[PDB]
Symmetry: D3
Subunit: 233 residues, 6 copies
C-alpha cells in the first residue's frame, strides 16, 4: 500500500509499539506475543501483530533519525489507521537525576532539527506526548513498582554530537537523556491528531561515561517492554 510498508489495510492493531531497531521489534514479538505474525518487512524494517495476554497489539520499526521515524509514523497513521503509538528505545543519559537502568517518560522532546520549524511557521513548536497515555504510563509503573522518571529528552540529528559541551546546559533544562526520534514522533502525531508517547531506558550515561554490559542490556530493556505492553492493557 505505502512506499515503506507493504502490510495489509487492517493488519495493524490501533495500538502499536515502536522501536528504531527492527531486531527488538521481533524480540518483543517472539518473547512476548502469542499469535505472532509478521506483517511488514520493506527495507527489512519489520512489524508484527500478535496478542499480549489476550489483547491484540501491533509492533513496528521506525529506523533511526527524525526523518526516518516521521516516514513510518505518518504511514501507520494516515494509511493503517493507527491511533496510539508508543515508542520505546534506549538513550544516553545526561542528567545527574538519571542512573543507568532507569526508564524515562518524555513529557517533551526538544530538538536541533529544523523539521518542526519547517512545519510550524518557523516558530518554536513545543513537541509533547499525548497526555492520557502519559498518566497511563505513571499509573502502570507505580502499579508495577517501577520508579518511572519523568522529564524532557533532547532529540538530536547527531548520534556523534558536535555539541557535547552543551549536555550540562540541556540537563540543566530538565533534559534527562538524548535520543533521536521523539520530536519527529510527537510532532507527526500532533500534525495528524493521533496519540503518542516515548519511553527510553538508560543504557549509557554520557556524563558518568558509564554503560551497561550486554547482560543487563536486554534485561533492563525487557523490564520496560512489559511496562509498555502493560500500560497497553
Amino acid at each position: 500500500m505505502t512506499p515503506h510498508i507493504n502490510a495489509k489495510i487492517g493488519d495493524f492493531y490501533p495500538q502499536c509499539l515502536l522501536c528504531g531497531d527492527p531486531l527488538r521489534v521481533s524480540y518483543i514479538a517472539k518473547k512476548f506475543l502469542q499469535d505472532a505474525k509478521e506483517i511488514t518487512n520493506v527495507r527489512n524494517m519489520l512489524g508484527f501483530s500478535g496478542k499480549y495476554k489476550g489483547r491484540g497489539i501491533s509492533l513496528m520499526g521506525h529506523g533511526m533519525g527524525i526523518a526516518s521515524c516521521t516516514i513510518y509514523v505518518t504511514e501507520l497513521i494516515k494509511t493503517y489507521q493507527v491511533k496510539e503509538l508508543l515508542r520505546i528505545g534506549t538513550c544516553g543519559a545526561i542528567s545527574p537525576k538519571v542512573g543507568l537502568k532507569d526508564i524515562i517518560m518524555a513529557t517533551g522532546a526538544s530538538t536541533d532539527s529544523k523539521t518542526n520549524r519547517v512545519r510550524f511557521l518557523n516558530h518554536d513548536l513545543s513537541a509533547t506526548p499525548d497526555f492520557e497515555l502519559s498518566l497511563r504510563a505513571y499509573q502502570t509503573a507505580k502499579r508495577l513498582g517501577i520508579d518511572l522518571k519523568v522529564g524532557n529528552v533532547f532529540s538530536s540529528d547527531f548520534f556523534y554530537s558536535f555539541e557535547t559541551h552543551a549536555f550540562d546546559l540541556m540537563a540543566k533544562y530538565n533534559h534527562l537523556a538524548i535520543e533521536m526520534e521523539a520530536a519527529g514522533l510527537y510532532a507527526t502525531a500532533m500534525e495528524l491528531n493521533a496519540k503518542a508517547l516515548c519511553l527510553c531506558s538508560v543504557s549509557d550515561h554520557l556524563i558518568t561515561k558509564e554503560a551497561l554490559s550486554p547482560k543487563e542490556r536486554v534485561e533492563s530493556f525487557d523490564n520496560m517492554i512489559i511496562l509498555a505492553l502493560e500500560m497497553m492493557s
Copy 2:
C-alpha cells in the same frame, strides 16, 4: 529585596499561584484566603500570603508577556525560594476542540518569542510543565467534576497578532488557545529547577468570535480559582 518584589524573606510560602492581572491576585486574596496579607506592591504588582483550608499559600501578579513573567518568576524562585508555581489566567481559544467555560491544562507552550533560542543554544526547547503538578491538576479536576481539556498552548509576543491566518495551523498541531506567558514560565522553571503549571480559562474564542458576559467571566474564572486552590491544599 529584589528590584521588582517588595517582600521580606519568608513572606512567600513555597507554593504560589500566579496571574497576569494584579487585581485578580487581590480579588483572589480577599474572597478566598484567610489571614491574607499584602506582601509586595512594586510597580503596583501585588502579591499576598494567606491560608486556604489551613494551608499557607502565596499569590503573585506577573504582568503581561514572557519578559515580564520571566522577571517575576526568577525572583520568586531564587530569592523567595518558591518551589511550586501555578499560573491561572484567560486565553483566546483557537481550537474547535474547546469552547467558552473550558479550563485548559497546558502540557506544552509553543512560542514566537526568541527567548528560548537564546536560552537553549538556538535550538528548539520544548517548554513543558512539571509532571507531578500536571498530575495533581488532573486528579483535582476529576474530584471536582471539571472537564479538563489538555493540550498545547501558544505563547505569543503579540496580543494583536500579525499571523491570524495561522491560527488553524496551530490548532491542527493541538494548540488549544493563545496566551502570552506560559512558555516563559515553563522555561524559567526548567532553568531554575522548580515546578510549574499553567491553567487557562476560555473567556473568548478567536475563531468562533464568541465571547461571554462580563459576569460569567468572574464565575468561570472562579471555577479555575477553586480548582487551583484545591490542588495545593
Copy 3:
C-alpha cells in the same frame, strides 16, 4: 473600551508621556502636572490627563518588556488617537561614554527579541525614533543646560541576562545602556505612522557597578521629567 484601557474615547491628549512603572506615572501626575485626573486603571496600569504650562499632557504606564509595551501603545495610537509618545525610564549603562545621572536619547533601539523579524519580513528592522521629536529633545535639553548623551540602546527580553559577556561588544557598537521596551515602542510607532522617542536616565552602571543613592535617583528622574514636560509644551 480596549481590554487593557478603560478610558473613554477622547480622555487622552494627543501627546503622551510613558513609563514602565504606573507608580512613576502616578508620581508625575501628582507632583508635576496641573489638574490631573486618573483616566485608566485596568490591571493597575494607571494613566492620567492633566495640564502643564497651559497644555494638555497625558501619562500612561506600559509595564515591563516589549510585548507589554506593544499592547499599550498599539491601543493608545489606534483607539485613543495618541500621536506623540515620549517614553522616559531608567536604564543600566554599559558604555564608558555615559555616567550616573546622564540622560540618554535613544536614536536606535537594537534587540534580542524576535518581534521585529516577525513584523518585518524576517529581515533586520532598524528601529528608530521620530527625528523631529529627537530634535525637540536636543533643543529643550540645550535650553535646560542638560548635556544629552545620544546613541543606541539595547532592548532585551531579559532583565537577568544570559549574555553578560557581550555587554562590551554592545558598548563597542554605540549601545550606551540596556533597557527592555524601546525597540517595541519604536517598531509599533513605525508600524502605525506615529511619532515616538525614548529617553533613559542612567541610575546604575552595569560595568563599573556604581549606583545612585535613593535621594540621587529621585533627583535624577525629576530632571528627566522636567526635560520631558518641557519638550511636549
Copy 4:
C-alpha cells in the same frame, strides 16, 4: 565494533557502494559480486564484501534520511577505514530536464535540514561531492554510452513534503530531483576527508506524476549498478 555495524576492521574494502534499502544492497551482492560475503547486520542493515571484475568492492546500507546516513557514513569512515563512498538510489524528479529512466549525478546537495548549519557555523555549507569521483562517473558513463544528467539534488528531511509549492523554484535553480540523503553524505565526507558521490535513478516524476512500472524499477536500476561498479574498476 560500533553501535550500528557488526563487521570487524578488515571486512570492508576501501571502496564502498551505498544504498538506503538494505535489500537492495543484497540484490547487488547476489547478482554482481563473486565471493559475496555478508559482513554486518545490526538493526538488520546489511553490508557485503565481494569482487567485481577482479577488484574488491564493498556494499553497505544506510537507511533513510540525513541523520541515518550520517551515522553509517561516519562509522564506515572512522572505524572501517572506507575512503570512497558512492551512493546510488532512487529519486523523485522535479525538473523538465530529466525524464524517467534517467540517471542523475548530484554535483551538489541543497537541503532543508539544519545539520549543515549546526556543522558549519550557522552559515551555508555548499555540500558537494569529491571532484575526482564525479570525473570518473562521467568518463565511465561516457564509455558505457549512458547519458548522464548532471546537476543538483535537493535533500529533504521530508518524504511527505509540506512545501510542494516550492518544487518549481527548486528546479529553476537546477535541482533535478529530491531525495533524503545526499547532503548528509557529502557533508560527513567533507568533514572526515573522504571521497563521496551520489548517483540516483529517476523512479518517479513528482510534477508530471508518472512513475516506473513494477518491471521497470529494477530494469533501469541495473544500468546504474554497472556504472557504479565499472567506475570502481
Copy 5:
C-alpha cells in the same frame, strides 16, 4: 598601503564624502573643489582631496553593496584616520511621502543582509547615523532652503529584488527608499567609533514608476552635492 587604497598616509582629510560611483567622485572633484588632487585609484575606484571654501575635503568612491562599502569604509577609518563620513547617492523611493528630487536623510538603515547578525550576536543591530552629523545636515538644509525628508532606508543585497511585493510594508514602517550600502556604512562606523550619515536623492520612484530625466538628474545631484560640501565646511 591597504589592498584597496594606494594613497600616502595623510592624503585624506578627516572629513570624507562617499559615492558608490567613482566617476561621480571624479565629477565632484573637478566641478566643486579647489586644487583637487587624485590620491588613490586601485581597481579604478578613485579618491581625491581638495578644498571647499578654504577647508580640506576628501572624496572616495566605495562601489556597490554592503561588502564593497564595508571594505573602503573600514580602511578609511582604521588606516587613513578618516573621522566623519558623509555618503550621498541616488535611491529608488518606495514611500508616498517622497517624490522626485527630494533629498532623504536616513536616520536608520534596515537590511536583508546577514552582515549585522554576524557582527552583533545574531541579534538585531539597529544601524543608525551619528546624531550630530544628522543635526548638522538638518540645519544646513534649512539654511539652504532644502526640506529634508527624514526616515529609514532599506539597504538590500539585491538591486533586482525578489521581494518587490514587500515594498508596501517597508514603506508602512517608515522606509522611504531602497539603496544598497547605508546599513554597512552605519554598522562599520558604529564598530569603529566613527561619525557617519547617508543622504539620498530621489531620482526614481519604484511605486509610481516616475523617474528624472538625465538633465534633471545632474541638477538634482548638484543640489545635494552643495548640501554636503556646505555641511562639512
Copy 6:
C-alpha cells in the same frame, strides 16, 4: 540599456571572463587578445570584446562582493545573452592542501551571506558551478600541465573577517580558500539557467601568513588567464 553597462546590443560575445578588478580586465585586453575594443565603462567598471585565436571573447569587471557581482552577472545574462561566464580572481588560502601560486577550481561556494536563503525558501542552497565548464577546465589545465587544486571556497561578505578563529573548521570541510563573489555568481547562474565557473589563484595564505610579491602576483595570474582563455577556445 542597463544602469550598469552601456554596451550596445550584441557587443558581448556569449563567452565572458570576469574579474573583480576592472584594471585586471583592461590588462587582459591589451596583453592577451587581438582587436580588443572597450564596450562598457559605467562607474569605471570596464568591459571589453576581442579575439583569442580568432574566436570572440568578452571581458567584464564585476566589483567586490556578492551583491555587486550579482548585479553585473544578472545583466550580462538577461540583457546581453551571455551564456558562459568564467570568473578568475585571487583569494586567501586557508588550507594546507594549497599554497601560493596554486589555482583552485571552486566546485562549491559556501557563504555567510543571506542572499541564497532569500532566493531559496530560507533553506540551504548548495551553490555550484556548471559541471561541463568545470570538466572543460580540468581537461584544459591537464592539457596545459597545470596542477589544478579542486575543492570549495567560502564566499564572505567580509574582507576583514570577524571569525578568523573558524578558518580551520572551514579548511577541515575542504574549503581551500576565501573569496567574496563565487556564491553570488553560482546562485545567479543557477537562477537564470546559465553556465559559470570560478577559478582562484592563491596570492596570500591566511594561516601561514605567506604572501606573494608584486611580481609573483602577475606571473601567476597570467597562468590563470591562459587557462581561462584556452578553455573558451
